[PDB]
Design a protein around this nucleic acid. Structure first.
Ligand SMILES: N[C@@H](CC(=O)O)C(=O)O
Ligand SMILES: [Mg+2]
Ligand SMILES: [Mg+2]
Ligand SMILES: [Mg+2]
Ligand SMILES: [Mg+2]
Ligand SMILES: [Mg+2]
Ligand SMILES: [Mg+2]
Ligand SMILES: [Mg+2]
Ligand SMILES: [Mg+2]
Ligand SMILES: [Mg+2]
Ligand SMILES: [Mg+2]
Ligand SMILES: [Mg+2]
Ligand SMILES: [Mg+2]
Ligand SMILES: [Mg+2]
Ligand SMILES: [Mg+2]
Ligand SMILES: [Mg+2]
Ligand SMILES: [Mg+2]
Ligand SMILES: [Mg+2]
Ligand SMILES: [Mg+2]
Ligand SMILES: [Mg+2]
Lengths: 70, 116, 153, 66
RNA sequence: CUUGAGUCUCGUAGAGGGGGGUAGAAUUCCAGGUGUAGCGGUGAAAUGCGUAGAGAUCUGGAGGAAUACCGGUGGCGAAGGCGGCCCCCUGGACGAAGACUGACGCUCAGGUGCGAAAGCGUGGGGAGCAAACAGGAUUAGAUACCCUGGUAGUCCACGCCGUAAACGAUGUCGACUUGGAGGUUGUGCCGGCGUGGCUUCCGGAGCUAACGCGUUAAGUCGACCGCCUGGGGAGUACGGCCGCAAGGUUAAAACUCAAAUGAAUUGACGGGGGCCCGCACAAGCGGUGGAGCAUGUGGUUUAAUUCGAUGCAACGCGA
């Protein structure tokens, strides 16, 4: 995430461009994910739980479109 | 006593503390300041405000070298990442570029999860 | 409360000067619903104060407050079992109320003989940054400054 | 979406083809997911092999902080 | 005889396996430079490291272990499991057009092999992590959780162990029985229409105690095997076999109980979640708790100190 400040560029927006580049690279999450050891059993329990919950919200959204609240 | 006008700031932002080291382009340190040594202990030490004070003291520590432009190399996940870069600009340096140099293994086993 | 159905209460101005800020000071100083006793204390204190500084009745009382009004204060918040004092800005109405309350409580804990003189002496030092009313403002500002790192929730 | 390797009928993604490979890595040098670029699963694997194979020959970088 | 089973031909995908080599990032250590007072850690601290110059930053080197992104209810494998890249050796699966053999099948007690991790043996290696251990805290205590260190071990070679919630808690093979939405990998024809393999989710009949399963069945059937017979005692004892040991395996009874249990229901509760409320906090003011007295209660005393109320919701209460 290398941001080179451009000419006639106000500082803050370059600081905004930097915050964007680090989040798109996901480096902060990558550091937080690597600070404690994650067992292979648990990484898989999470991955699965992520997928089944990502799946459930889609069908819940498809279904809620065929509904009225009032 | 030497005049450089072109230095590099190394923000070391951990979850517990922030260290600011201003080096020349060759990597030789000119001065440094930390959030812990800026009058902040414990809960205060790991705040964005404690890092801002740490940045200002490091800018006040290298004032005799007359640095004019300053590269900023940010490392770590700490709360003192963003607020330390602002304080370097507030002092009166010119931020030429900002980079994240946080080391990522592509490595060793990390310590075990804390059961708090 | 939880509903926020609190509207502001009406308050009649002071008789001698028609100052709304002065009427609230009498109420703060009043004890047991004896407002007439509190007005006579406040008036004779102001006559001593105005004569002692030569400025005037009202705006010489305003100079006492301007050196006692706090501008930042800490509210408790417990996060990890340990309680953080979080400094928060004081809105203008509470700044006036705190300053008047701090003056009255500092005056009461004074060794003068009569309260009217006791109040005037406290206000006189407060005008010149010497009283125990301004010292409590001193304390609040440094308790808020020791916690500037916590200006967040 | 619109996988550009079925569209161009590629038979192998050819790590020597640095012109193509640079379109499928980020600014910091990481392979972009097939979810973002809409590459087919079959070609995304060959793309990752070619990128790792070019990284070894220093035709491509591993990271941006070399 | 050719439809089950198999062989040949062309290709496809794959972390299938075994052996060798190598790359980049990072950690740690070593040596040096700049520099100076903290670093580290936590809920907060302390232990610990640091003026003998740490931490930070740069330069060079050593070493081991794991391969970010790609990466996906994606793939491969009988299962256990398998993830950088390259080569060598090797297994299986699938698909298309035929040819060939001629049911040559399925299942399988005993037997044989493979079989996570921990562990064991011998010889290496040892960065990071980390049982044991040591210290610092926390605590009433804290043989813990947290912190700082740290040895076996984790890694390699060969040998042993032979067990796991080794799970889909679902044996293997075959046939049959409405659908929808995907993923993945072939293939034929003209993005469109077919046809195969594997796989994920929903659901119909049916089935089920229910939950649920539902063409990958827990539906309808056939073939063969394994296993069960109330809970505890007990997967324990004794014996045999196996093992270097740790132990594994096979596997009781006396005794005792009248239940133990599965699924779902209604509550209640949670140091679960969400949304609300109340002098519930907060923001304020005045009190009580200290003093004297009044009054009630307890206790004690008395011949009697009449009886009752006695968490909130008894105690200036019946009175
Ligand atoms: N970081 C890589 C290996 C190193 O570290 C991984 O997580 O697999
Ligand atoms: Mg730690
Ligand atoms: Mg064959
Ligand atoms: Mg057998
Ligand atoms: Mg092992
Ligand atoms: Mg060993
Ligand atoms: Mg050994
Ligand atoms: Mg430990
Ligand atoms: Mg398993
Ligand atoms: Mg499983
Ligand atoms: Mg079983
Ligand atoms: Mg179903
Ligand atoms: Mg036994
Ligand atoms: Mg035995
Ligand atoms: Mg309150
Ligand atoms: Mg009393
Ligand atoms: Mg009674
Ligand atoms: Mg009684
Ligand atoms: Mg009641
Ligand atoms: Mg009453």
């Amino acid at each position: 995430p290398v941001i080179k400040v451009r000419e006639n560029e106000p500082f803050d927006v370059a600081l905004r461009r930097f915050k964007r580049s680090c989040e798109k690279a996901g480096v902060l999450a990558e550091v937080r994910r690597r600070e404690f050891y994650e067992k292979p059993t648990t990484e898989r329990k999470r991955a699965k739980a992520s997928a089944v919950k990502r799946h459930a919200k889609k069908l819940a959204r498809e279904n809620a479109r065929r509904t009225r609240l009032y | 006593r030497k005049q450089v006008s072109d230095g590099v700031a190394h923000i070391h932002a951990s979850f517990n503390n922030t260290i600011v080291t201003i080096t020349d382009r060759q990597g030789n340190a000119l001065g440094w300041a930390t959030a812990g040594g800026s009058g902040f202990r414990g809960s205060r030490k790991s705040t964005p405000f404690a890092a801002q004070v740490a940045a200002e003291r490091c800018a006040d520590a290298v004032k005799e070298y007359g640095i004019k432009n300053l590269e900023v190399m940010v490392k770590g996940p700490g709360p003192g990442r963003e607020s330390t870069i602002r304080a370097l600009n507030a002092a009166g340096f010119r931020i030429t570029n900002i980079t994240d140099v946080t080391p990522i293994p592509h490595g060793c086993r990390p310590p075990k999860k804390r059961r708090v | 409360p939880r509903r926020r159905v609190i509207g502001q209460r009406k308050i009649l101005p002071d008789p001698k000067f028609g100052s709304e800020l002065l009427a609230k000071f009498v109420n703060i100083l009043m004890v047991d619903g004896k407002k007439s006793t509190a007005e006579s204390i406040v008036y004779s204190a102001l006559e001593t104060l105005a004569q002692r500084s030569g400025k005037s009745e009202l705006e010489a009382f305003e100079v006492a407050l301007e050196n006692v009004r706090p501008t930042v204060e800490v509210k408790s918040r417990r996060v990890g079992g340990s309680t953080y004092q979080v400094p928060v800005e004081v809105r203008p109405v509470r700044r006036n109320a705190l300053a008047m309350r701090w003056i009255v409580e500092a005056a009461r804990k004074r060794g003068d003989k009569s309260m009217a003189l006791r109040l005037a002496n406290e206000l006189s030092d407060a005008a010149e940054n010497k009283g125990t009313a301004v010292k409590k403002r001193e304390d609040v500002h440094r308790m808020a400054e020791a916690n500037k790192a916590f200006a967040h929730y | 979406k619109f996988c550009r390797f079925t569209a161009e009928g590629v038979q192998e993604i050819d790590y020597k083809d640095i012109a193509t490979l640079k379109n499928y890595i980020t600014e910091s040098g990481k392979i972009v997911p097939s979810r973002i670029t809409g590459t087919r699963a079959k070609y995304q694997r060959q793309l990752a092999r070619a990128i790792k194979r070019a990284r070894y020959l220093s035709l491509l970088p591993y990271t941006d902080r070399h």
